Symmetry: C3
Subunit: 246 residues, 3 copies
């Protein structure tokens, strides 16, 4: 048993909705320090790490650390019914379902049966990112979108004072450039000229759920994975780790 | 002949659009006291009563009480072309069509042939409602919508200080609760604990055309019909009478 | 080579998008006085004339007058990615593609291969328009739309103090009337009572890309073509010449 409460059900729906983009099924670790979740897409190309500490919850009462299995699509169809000014209550009895409550103009309660989830325990090799990039969400989603007009894959090129996302076609070619003079670029650190490429289908599902002025941080290296971070209520962290196109 | 005028064509389109949800064909009684319409859905599960008195019309000139037949879909495709600041003019000559005019930035006139409509004359048995409920439209449409995630039918349960719309599934279950402490509940009177169930497909079409902050009144009894009211310009009344699931 | 710049990429996308409605392929004449384009729909029923003078461009640098061929759909899929506050740069090297750049939160560059376009040189017979009409875009698009409920074709009837767009059916009939008392009518000059008819499918594609409060001027004559003008930044001119239904 636990009772966990989040003010603004529509925001929380958005996290879940984002993770649901690549995840079908996930195991949620619920501790007193917080809630965490680690899953992979079906193709095992994307890793997802979600970390929701106590501090972003209005009431966090975990008596008996616990892991629960959740079908991510049925969870997101339910959360999508919560409205922006609703209070969300995730609560668990001695049974095997998640109580999901929206409290706003009314008390609306759903019961979502908890499932049995394959808890693969695997993690990380070398993480020698030689590049760090912070940009506005709308650049990144624009970039994924423009490149999709042209190609399968998008190449990330980080140099000097330049970050470049480039895609090329059989006649067309697109290229998005960000220098520190640009409004869309919040930060750029480059230990070494770095080139790498990623599947646009994957990138696209990663950034669907990303907001207007959201700040996203990318870390990557030459022909190695792409790490994409963005923060939730300043203390939540959603991380994607994307395999490169080789 | 008659000339009837309504300021705000888009509002009137909305009534008609709502009634059109369950009605294909209808007969409109046009008198000097007002306009009224009584029809049933094809399955004869829902009764619709619409009452539009003189007082909600800017000009109401009925010389020769008259009943006219209208195809409800062709009427609603036409009314859907009227814009919010348009003045609506429903006018009839000695011919067999309805003149529908929108007057705004321009005079736009449609002619809708009047049809021959089966005027079944039937009405009401016992109406021993042991429960009355007034709630915000957005609760009701949220409620119909959440339950549709789970089930065929939605059970209405009115007790003490509680109103409850509940649906259950084969694994999932949803429940919407309203007490007078709640913002969404405007009024609750319960002569006796009352339980009854309704088809969600029917409920859904009943509340599609219902507005944000609209106030809806429900009256029902145990295993008997559901009456749903809401008002139009404070003096119009649209009523649904819904057969229970038995 | 040339460099041409337009502040507000989304506006320019809208011109192009409008012309693209009837045009698949077009040749763009680029001179020092401005940019112009003349094309016809596949059915050779509509003529399109587009004129974009230097004065509507923030930077206009044409060294070597030049004509370029453009696939209109690939150009409009690209321009549709420019956002409202973007600066648009159309630039050309000694190669055979158009550089399309959006400069805003970032530098986004597309390369659109220039094509080979059938440059038919044909133009105009008698232009004895006996009627001139200026109206709000929302009337015209409403009018095309209401008539589509009823018929293949829309008849334009200009008299005294009256302009009338009328369509009739096999039971239904629609009629839109504009007199100088009306808000939607900005101007009306009638040398002679004028009647003519046009295909609604064509009209509809002509006015899709037309704005809320846009002012459109129609000139036509009895059973002769319809000329439709509207202006861009007060000095751009997009013209349609539509064959009548005979």
């Amino acid at each position: 048993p636990f009772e966990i409460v989040f003010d603004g059900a529509k925001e929380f729906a958005d996290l879940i909705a984002t993770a649901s983009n690549l995840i079908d099924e996930a195991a949620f670790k619920i501790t007193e320090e917080g809630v965490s979740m680690r899953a992979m897409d079906p193709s095992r190309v994307v890793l997802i790490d979600l970390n929701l500490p106590e501090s972003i919850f209005s009431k966090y009462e975990v008596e008996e650390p616990e892991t629960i299995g959740i079908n991510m699509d049925h969870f997101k169809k339910i959360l999508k019914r919560g409205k922006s000014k609703d209070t969300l209550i995730l609560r668990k009895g001695d049974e095997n379902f998640l109580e999901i409550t929206f409290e706003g103009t009314a008390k609306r309660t759903f019961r979502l049966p908890l499932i049995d989830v394959e808890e693969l325990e695997l993690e990380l090799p070398e993480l020698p990112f030689t590049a760090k990039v912070v940009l506005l969400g709308e650049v990144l989603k624009e970039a994924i979108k423009d490149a999709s007009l042209v190609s399968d894959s998008l190449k990330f090129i980080a140099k000097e004072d330049e970050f470049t996302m480039k895609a090329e076609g059989e006649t067309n070619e697109v290229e998005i450039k960000l220098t520190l003079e640009d409004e869309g670029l919040l930060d750029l650190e480059v230990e070494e000229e770095t080139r790498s490429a990623y599947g646009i289908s994957y990138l696209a599902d990663m950034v669907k759920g990303i907001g207007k002025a959201d700040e996203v941080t990318l870390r990557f290296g030459t022909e190695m994975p792409l790490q994409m971070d963005y923060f939730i209520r300043d203390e939540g962290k959603l991380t994607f780790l994307l395999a490169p196109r080789v």
